Symmetry: C3
Subunit: 167 residues, 3 copies
């Protein structure tokens, strides 16, 4: 039914190194900010843990175990707090972090919205079975990105992945 207050709490999973990825994430953020069903959005790369004992940290890049633990746990906490996952999913460069997180959320029985992106529509349209069956809602990033502004995250209606060859 119609929610009295917004209840949607989104875990936004995405790689964040290159341009386009960062641009995708930013646009996703604005779109979600326009959605009246959303109470909160968590994006892992926004904040960050600082290890006082960590000298000259990179990103390459050997990191302290304290930093690793704190950041990983910040992400798991984000998944725990979240009601649903929204993943900006690069089909050209598969991100195993995002896949890990999708599997994690599905094991918790939480709904997962997959938002796939490709710069090669001329190439074969294929998906790993675990992703294709694991995700509960697909919203195409190249053609339907704008739907993130209107999607009812209070209820997260299903939309099974179809039209992808499956391996």
């Amino acid at each position: 039914m119609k929610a009295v207050v917004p209840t949607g709490k989104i875990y936004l999973g995405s790689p964040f190194y290159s341009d386009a990825q960062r641009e995708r994430a930013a646009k996703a953020k604005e779109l979600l900010a326009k959605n009246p069903s959303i109470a909160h959005v968590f994006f892992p790369f926004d904040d960050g843990f600082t290890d006082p004992d960590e000298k000259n940290p990179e990103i390459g890049g050997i990191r302290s175990m304290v930093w690793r633990d704190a950041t990983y746990q910040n992400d798991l906490t984000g998944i725990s707090n979240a009601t649903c996952g929204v993943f900006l999913y690069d089909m050209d460069q598969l991100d195993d972090g995002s896949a890990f997180e999708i599997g994690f959320m599905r094991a918790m029985h939480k709904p997962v919205i997959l938002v796939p992106f490709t710069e090669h529509p001329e190439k074969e349209k294929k998906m790993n079975l675990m992703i294709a069956q694991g995700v509960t809602t697909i919203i195409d990033g190249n053609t339907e990105f704008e739907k993130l502004a209107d999607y009812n995250f209070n209820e997260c209606p299903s939309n099974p992945v179809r039209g992808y060859g499956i391996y």
Copy 2:
């Protein structure tokens, strides 16, 4: 304590074919709508998934696997998002869907409010052990239905099933 905003998110479980069942559901919805502790109510039958490749689908009839998956997942998603379950539970015609959902929610450690209905109070008062022990709060549907309007769904105080013979 007193909630700053309503936090109650209800999964409302009930069969929805017959008259009476539908009436029960409607009254339940109104009562819950009057409750200030509730942020959201999900009722499985309100919306629906439409499989484009499904021609002339019948309730009770053979359904496509896509529709089955999407609908089942819509319910599981509702259970996931919910903080608690409220089941309009017909003691005269046992619904195994509702029982399934009760078990699912209890396995997730979520509280379950059972709202039993009978058209034969003069008849034997008996309940299956898994339901009687599984549910955390009982509110009699014939005599206490109205309590759905005032019950504090921010905290869901317990009220164990008593007065039922157990098999």
Copy 3:
């Protein structure tokens, strides 16, 4: 990133026998009430279940199984509804109830804020490995209690236990 509404739902775990304990709980409650990230706070001892069939029940005495079940379940329900745990943790008299609840919440992947108190700073600073590693954020109760008023419970940033000997 920034919440549209507060989403923090706190399970406040603490013993409630001594005046010192009750005072800690009270101050904690007041501090949390000032936190704009918090939607709701649950404290187990605030309310109570009353077993009509229980004659002259005594705190610390033999309790009816109905009371035991209902009360235990009220706590588990509090943990279920909660997004995170905040534990007023007496390092001088270890409370196994609170520890139980911490383990329960961590098994559910929920974040746990430990707020340790000691009146014997002269003694060695030691912690059980399961508590030190189980907890996701430590806020010292003796020196940093007030931080409960400002902490962002929408996201619950990590802060690993350091400075304690580990046994």
